[PDB]
């Protein structure tokens, strides 16, 4: 609770985001008589009048492949062909497969890393990059206990404030980052040498 | 909207700063600053 | 009551003086601080093998004022070599002990 | 012009157009198209490293390959001409390169099947903002009705 | 304290804004120990011809040293060249902007 | 800078020839300060000669 | 696995360079250009390099965000940063 107090009080967030944030599930259930998230989420408006349901079995994240289902999540979670498999990538990467299962939690843990990116004012690639700086690279959201999801957003937020006062973009601590795994030298190498 | 077209003219007139300090800045840093033709000035100026 | 009208007056005054000469309080420190010497820096040898190599500076005076004026006011980043070279002659003629 | 100088055709406007491409590549390529160039001079051209360069995933341009397949093998600038308006086609659509052959096979075809065409609609909508979806809404029920 | 309206009857809470940070950049003399005197050797000529050809490579670094001052002086008036025209074109963003 | 370490030791030749014809070891004319890495050498030949 | 300047110094001088260890000086200057990147996206000064030539660590996050402290701190110095570094290049930095 007071995490969720303390993000939205800084980043200036609805509260149901904050709660998303503090590794809470998706609710199917219509809260005050409106849209629940779920269906604010995937189902307004019905893709192709599909409303989409957790049938199970059935998702493929891989790009090259065809399947309905991947496209409410792409709609849902605001996100590219790509990115969509980058999502999956950041979700775990010792995991490395490439279907998910069509359950409530995949979706919200989908869902988190969205957040992750939308929040910090990152993008999906962006937050890729910049988990492996972090001594996050191996993490897991369905092992994330409530004190390594605690520091790894304090991480992010410390790491984003830093990037925007010292004027520089996170594309340029990438190249600050890079480890070489080196090819052939240039032409201007060889006038170098 | 005038408002917020004169805050981007506040946003504008601080960049204008930062680049004024980058240029006394490479001023400095630079070899060819006021302090090297000093000392040679005063060095040829004595063997002269 | 006489000491404190007398010092009141000095801090009006030195407020004053240093708000039409345009210079801060910290500047004035600067102006008056005691040395206190330490350790050298290392300018400071380039200083001193830059007078100790060159032309020997000669035992004449006024002599001595234009041979090591040139160093001096390239040293301090003056304007003319002869004003470094009076400057020489204005900490000779008064300076702290 | 050195990457054009051994052997770009010039001379007719089918070529002025991938002359055109080439230089817009280029640069988009900017600051990096150094290296860039001298990679293609030699034989060591590949998607990393013009992903690196373009500040694009190496998982998109790898895509524009694969349309007019050429898909591994860089060594020429005449499929570097290629990438640039299949770039521009998939920024204006907010999809990615794979995303677009079903585009041109599904509509130009006379008898589209009705699961290609759905699996295109949902395909297009998705990358559509929030706004633009409540508008295409408002748009598509009174229809339904 | 409001009015019927709800319209509070005090002055709001004002506050004044902060004054603009000057900016300041480190600022280093350039430090450096002269190069000691290489070894000596007995040549084969006389002094009178050893002093000429002495005298030839002195000038030739002369040479050397004007020209390497004007590749210096070029190369940063080059370089500041440049960095005016980066300005101009992110300036030119916020104009535009 | 490896022009200065040819022409520093044309120096020491001439100041050796002048030591040896005239018997005055004791003198020296060619003395150290020349090059200075603050103005990154520029001016020694000045000095030398 | 990157060269010892004087390793390079050996390599770069040899009969023929093979096809292999030639990638090898390769890597060196690609990670004597990013060192170079990481001197211009803090605006470092020469003073200020020199201080951190003599054993910085770079290479990893937390240790940029002590080169940006340490960069911030020469920053509010300023004109009478020149005095501080050497002072602290020698043992003689106090806190007066």
Not at chain 3, 37 to 61: F, H, S
Not at chain 7, 2 to 26: C, H, M, N, P, Y
Request: proline fraction near 4%; aromatic fraction near 6%.
């Amino acid at each position: 609770f007071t995490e969720t107090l303390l993000y939205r009080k800084r980043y200036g967030i609805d509260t149901e985001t904050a709660l998303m944030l503090c590794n809470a599930g998706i609710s199917r259930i219509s809260y005050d008589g409106q849209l629940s998230h779920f269906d604010r989420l995937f189902n307004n408006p019905p893709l192709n009048g599909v409303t989409y349901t957790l049938g199970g079995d059935d998702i493929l994240m891989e790009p090259d492949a065809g399947d309905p289902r991947r496209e409410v999540l792409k709609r849902a979670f605001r996100v590219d062909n790509t990115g969509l498999w980058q999502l999956l990538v950041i979700t775990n990467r010792e995991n490395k497969s490439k279907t998910i299962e069509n359950k409530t939690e995949k979706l919200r843990g989908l869902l988190f890393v969205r957040l992750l990116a939308d929040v910090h004012n990152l993008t999906v690639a962006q937050l890729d990059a910049l988990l492996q700086i972090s001594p996050y690279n191996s993490m897991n959201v369905y092992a994330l206990d409530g004190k390594t999801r605690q520091k790894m957003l304090s991480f992010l937020s410390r790491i984003t404030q830093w990037l925007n006062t010292q004027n520089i973009t996170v594309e340029q601590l990438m190249l600050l980052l890079d480890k070489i795994s080196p090819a052939a030298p240039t032409k201007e190498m060889q006038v170098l040498l | 909207v005038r408002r917020t077209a004169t805050e981007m003219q506040r946003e504008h007139m601080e960049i204008q700063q930062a680049q004024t300090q980058a240029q006394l800045e490479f001023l400095q840093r630079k070899f060819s600053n006021k302090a090297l033709y000093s000392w040679l000035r005063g060095r040829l100026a004595s063997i002269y | 009551g006489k000491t404190r009208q007398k010092m009141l007056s000095f801090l009006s005054r030195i407020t004053q003086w240093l708000n039409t000469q345009n210079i801060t309080v910290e500047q004035l420190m600067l102006l008056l601080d005691k040395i206190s010497p330490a350790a050298p820096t290392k300018e400071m040898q380039v200083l001193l093998d830059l007078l100790r190599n060159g032309g020997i500076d000669k035992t004449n005076t006024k002599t001595l004022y234009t041979t090591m004026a040139p160093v001096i006011t390239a040293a301090m980043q003056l304007d003319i070599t002869e004003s470094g070279e009076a400057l020489l002659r204005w900490l000779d003629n008064n300076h702290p002990a | 012009l050195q990457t054009l100088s051994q052997g770009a055709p010039a001379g007719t406007i089918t070529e002025l157009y991938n002359i055109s491409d080439f230089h817009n590549l280029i640069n988009r390529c900017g600051e990096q198209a150094g290296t860039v160039l001298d990679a293609l001079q030699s034989g060591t051209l590949t998607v990393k490293i013009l992903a690196q360069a373009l500040n694009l995933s190496e998982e998109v341009i790898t895509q524009a390959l694969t349309l007019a397949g050429q898909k591994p093998e860089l060594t020429t600038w005449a499929q570097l001409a290629v990438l640039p308006p299949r770039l521009d086609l998939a920024d204006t659509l907010h999809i990615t390169p794979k995303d677009i052959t079903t585009l041109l096979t599904v509509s130009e075809n006379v008898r589209p099947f009705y699961t290609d065409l759905s699996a295109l609609a949902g395909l297009l909508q998705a990358g559509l903002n929030e706004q633009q979806t409540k508008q295409l809404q408002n748009q598509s029920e009174p229809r339904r009705n | 304290n409001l009015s019927i309206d709800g319209q509070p009857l005090s002055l709001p809470v004002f506050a004044a804004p902060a004054d603009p940070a000057a900016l300041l950049s480190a600022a280093a003399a350039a430090s450096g120990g002269s190069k000691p005197l290489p070894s000596a050797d007995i040549p084969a000529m006389r002094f009178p011809q050893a002093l000429d050809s002495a005298r030839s490579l002195t000038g030739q670094l002369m040479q050397f040293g004007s020209t390497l001052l004007g590749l210096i002086e070029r190369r940063d008036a080059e370089a500041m060249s440049e960095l005016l025209q980066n300005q101009a074109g992110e300036l030119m963003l916020s104009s535009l902007r | 800078y490896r022009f200065y370490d040819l022409t520093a030791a044309r120096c020491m030749m001439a100041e050796k020839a002048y030591a040896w014809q005239t018997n005055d070891t004791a003198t020296r004319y060619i003395k150290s300060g020349a090059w200075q890495s603050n103005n990154a050498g520029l001016m020694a030949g000045e000095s030398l000669l | 696995g990157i060269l010892t300047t004087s390793e390079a110094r050996k390599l770069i001088i040899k009969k023929g360079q093979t096809a292999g260890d030639k990638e090898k000086l390769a890597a060196w200057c690609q990670a004597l250009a990013q060192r170079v990147l990481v001197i211009r996206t803090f605006t470092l000064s020469n003073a200020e390099l020199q201080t951190l030539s003599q054993g910085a660590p770079a290479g990893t996050i937390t240790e940029l965000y002590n080169i940006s402290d340490f960069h911030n701190l020469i920053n509010r110095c300023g004109e009478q940063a020149g005095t501080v570094l050497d002072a602290l290049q020698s043992g003689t930095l106090t806190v007066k």
